[PDB]
Design an enzyme around this catalytic site. Sequence first.
Site, short mmCIF file in Angstrom:
data_model
loop_
_atom_site.label_atom_id
_atom_site.label_comp_id
_atom_site.label_asym_id
_atom_site.label_seq_id
_atom_site.Cartn_x
_atom_site.Cartn_y
_atom_site.Cartn_z
N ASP A 398 58.22 -3.61 -9.75
CA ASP A 398 58.51 -2.20 -9.45
C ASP A 398 58.70 -1.37 -10.70
O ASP A 398 58.25 -0.23 -10.75
CB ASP A 398 59.77 -2.05 -8.58
CG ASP A 398 59.57 -2.53 -7.14
OD1 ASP A 398 58.48 -2.33 -6.54
OD2 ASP A 398 60.54 -3.10 -6.63
N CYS A 432 46.63 4.14 -8.66
CA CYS A 432 48.00 3.68 -8.44
C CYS A 432 48.70 4.80 -7.68
O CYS A 432 48.19 5.19 -6.64
CB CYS A 432 48.70 3.22 -9.73
SG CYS A 432 48.83 4.42 -11.09
N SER A 433 49.83 5.30 -8.17
CA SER A 433 50.52 6.45 -7.56
C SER A 433 50.01 7.76 -8.18
O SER A 433 49.30 8.51 -7.53
CB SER A 433 52.01 6.32 -7.69
OG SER A 433 52.66 6.99 -6.63
N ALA A 434 50.36 8.04 -9.42
CA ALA A 434 49.95 9.29 -10.12
C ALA A 434 48.58 9.09 -10.78
O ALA A 434 47.87 10.05 -11.11
CB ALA A 434 51.01 9.65 -11.13
N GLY A 435 48.21 7.82 -10.97
CA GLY A 435 46.91 7.47 -11.44
C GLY A 435 46.80 7.50 -12.97
O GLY A 435 45.70 7.67 -13.50
N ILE A 436 47.91 7.34 -13.68
CA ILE A 436 47.86 7.38 -15.13
C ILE A 436 48.52 6.15 -15.75
O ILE A 436 48.05 5.74 -16.84
CB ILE A 436 48.44 8.70 -15.69
CG1 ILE A 436 49.92 8.89 -15.33
CG2 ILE A 436 47.60 9.89 -15.23
CD1 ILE A 436 50.52 10.23 -15.85
N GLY A 437 49.56 5.55 -15.17
CA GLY A 437 50.25 4.45 -15.92
C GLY A 437 49.58 3.08 -15.75
O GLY A 437 48.92 2.51 -16.68
N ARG A 438 49.75 2.53 -14.55
CA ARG A 438 49.11 1.25 -14.23
C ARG A 438 47.59 1.44 -14.31
O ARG A 438 46.89 0.62 -14.87
CB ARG A 438 49.49 0.77 -12.83
CG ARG A 438 50.95 0.40 -12.70
CD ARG A 438 51.27 0.04 -11.28
NE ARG A 438 52.69 -0.09 -11.11
CZ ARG A 438 53.29 -0.26 -9.94
NH1 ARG A 438 52.56 -0.55 -8.87
NH2 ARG A 438 54.60 -0.13 -9.85
N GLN A 479 51.19 4.65 -20.05
CA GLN A 479 52.39 5.48 -20.06
C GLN A 479 53.45 4.95 -21.04
O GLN A 479 54.18 5.74 -21.59
CB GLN A 479 52.99 5.59 -18.65
CG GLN A 479 52.30 6.65 -17.79
CD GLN A 479 52.59 8.07 -18.23
OE1 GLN A 479 53.73 8.50 -18.20
NE2 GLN A 479 51.56 8.80 -18.64
#
Length: 502
Positions: A398, A432-438, A479
């Site tokens: 998480d 992913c969620s925001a599409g930048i980290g993972r 990120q």
Amino acid sequence: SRRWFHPNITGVEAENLLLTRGVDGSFLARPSKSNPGDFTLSVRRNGAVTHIKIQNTGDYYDLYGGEKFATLAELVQYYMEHHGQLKEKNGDVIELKYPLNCADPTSERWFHGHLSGKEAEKLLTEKGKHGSFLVRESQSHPGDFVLSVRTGDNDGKSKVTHVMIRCQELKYDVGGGERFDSLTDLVEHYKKNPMVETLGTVLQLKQPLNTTRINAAEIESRVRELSKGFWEEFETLQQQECKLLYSRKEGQRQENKNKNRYKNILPFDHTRVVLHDGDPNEPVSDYINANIIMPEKKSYIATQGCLQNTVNDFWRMVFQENSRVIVMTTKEVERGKSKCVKYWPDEYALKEYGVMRVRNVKESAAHDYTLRELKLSKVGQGNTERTVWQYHFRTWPDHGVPSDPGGVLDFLEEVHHKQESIMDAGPVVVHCSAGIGRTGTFIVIDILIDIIREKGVDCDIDVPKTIQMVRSQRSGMVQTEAQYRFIYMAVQHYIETLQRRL
Ligand SMILES: Nc1ccnc2cc[nH]c12
């Protein structure tokens, strides 16, 4: 301006700095010391200083009582042009008016600190081109610095010139004329307005020396030397995000606001996916929060987790771009909050998403992921059906990164073989969620492995350079420092496997 970040500063110092050197509206950002990937925005307001926490656990920068951002530079640009959107608990505005600049050169790509004269001549000889330079600490005169520059066309036609930079009561100068407040101010001056040698050679400062590139087979040794570091190499990369504030105007249009999961994390105009052949009724049907990422065969589309009102657009996108592979790197729900609505049908079920039909033919559970075999077609047009393979990575922790990369590597090998198995497959969709980290971490690992897969183990890789190129195509790809070390760990683990084979 691009120097409001102070890497090696403490709270105490930041407060005194703002109280002595700034005014109301002055501000700076800094890292927290032992707190992994926390930051603080310090701001002077009515002759007192306020500190504001920013957290990044790997998806985005969360500013307390402000919004979420893809980069700190995007955060500063947003609030330095939105007077009253940043507020305290009690609803007093906090104005960010005047960056408080930092003099520390440790984050600059040209700064080689504690390096000798002879070793600098060698690096410019082996790695350097015309106009290549570095700034290092002097050994003859302590306190001072030396700018070392390659000039010319290994046979005489080039040379290295060394310029002494004196430090004198807090300011820097090359022996006459202007005295600069920082080495960055100095370098930026003489790069605009180059020194001319007595006899006419121009000391062009064109690019810094590259010290990030490595032979892939030298990975084990570099990871070991970065482990002591990683923090400094990441910080230098982060500093270069100031260069990537490209426009995101389509994402900022009224018609498009409720198509963004987070209202300030937007796709760049220059690389956004453009949706054609939509409803004539809709006010704006060409928009989705997604960018094309082309490495510099396989390209990628980086995108956010679907919203309720973007699931249809997501499938319009997959159909348009002829994508045959989707990589999902979040659970739908983490820490009890929706990260991505279910945009695929249950096993053996069939659903219509606007003009698109999708059948879930079959699911296969593997240790770290589930594979969903989907069939996508345009309603009313047989012979448009194609298979879209959705690889859903399920075990990403998480917060933070997996302690071992083998799971990730096994997953991308499989994604890679499926992609390569389909003739003229379009770009692999990653979200992913925001599409930048993972999403950026998976893409960057995929780009680097690919090089090694083609060129084998005796090839050149450059992790920060690869991340910078990807960040130029979507805001803030990769990120956090933990993700940065993981990328290295991943590539090391890939290289070890390759050599145990042989
Ligand atoms: N030097 C830097 C400039 C802009 N953003 C960041 C984030 C960490 N370091 C940074």
